[PDB]
Amino acid sequence: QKLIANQFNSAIGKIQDSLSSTPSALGKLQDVVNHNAQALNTLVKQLS
Amino acid sequence: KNKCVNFNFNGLKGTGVLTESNKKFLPFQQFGRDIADTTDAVRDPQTL
Ligand SMILES: *[C@@H]1O[C@H](CO)[C@@H](O)[C@H](O)[C@H]1NC(C)=O
């Protein structure tokens, strides 16, 4: 039990650090915004 | 001013509410445009 608990705590700490370190890991969300907003821009450009 | 008053400034026609502006045009600047590439700021021909 103690070994499993220690491994689990270390793994969760590693996940926290990995999220804090890799910027593109959230790309699956980011592009969503980076799509929708830019689409609106194009629509507005059609007024010109 | 401060009403829906059609305006024809030096041959540029539009409709909207005229308000005092805080933007600082350069000395030669006449018309102001927004992100939408549409007229948003104007300079009065008679009074600078
Ligand atoms: C136009 O005339 C008005 C008064 O008639 C004056 O206040 C204004 O400065 C003049 N415009 C220019 C650009 O000199």
Q: Are B48 and B33 a contacting pair, CB within 8 Å?
A: no
Measured between alpha carbons, how far is A35 from B8 in angstroms, rounded to an integer? 38
Residue of A nearest to B36 (CA): A44
What letter does residue B44 receive in the DSSP assignment?
-
Contact A48 B35 (CB under 8 A): no
Contact B35 A47 (CB under 8 A): no
Write down the experimental method used for this entry: cryo-EM
Which H helix or E strand runs over B32?
Answer: strand B31-33
Measured between alpha carbons, how far is B31 from B38 in angstroms, rounded to an integer? 10
Q: Which of residues 6-45 of A touch B (CB under 8 A)?
A: 44-45
Question: Quick one: tokens of A7?
Answer: 């491994």
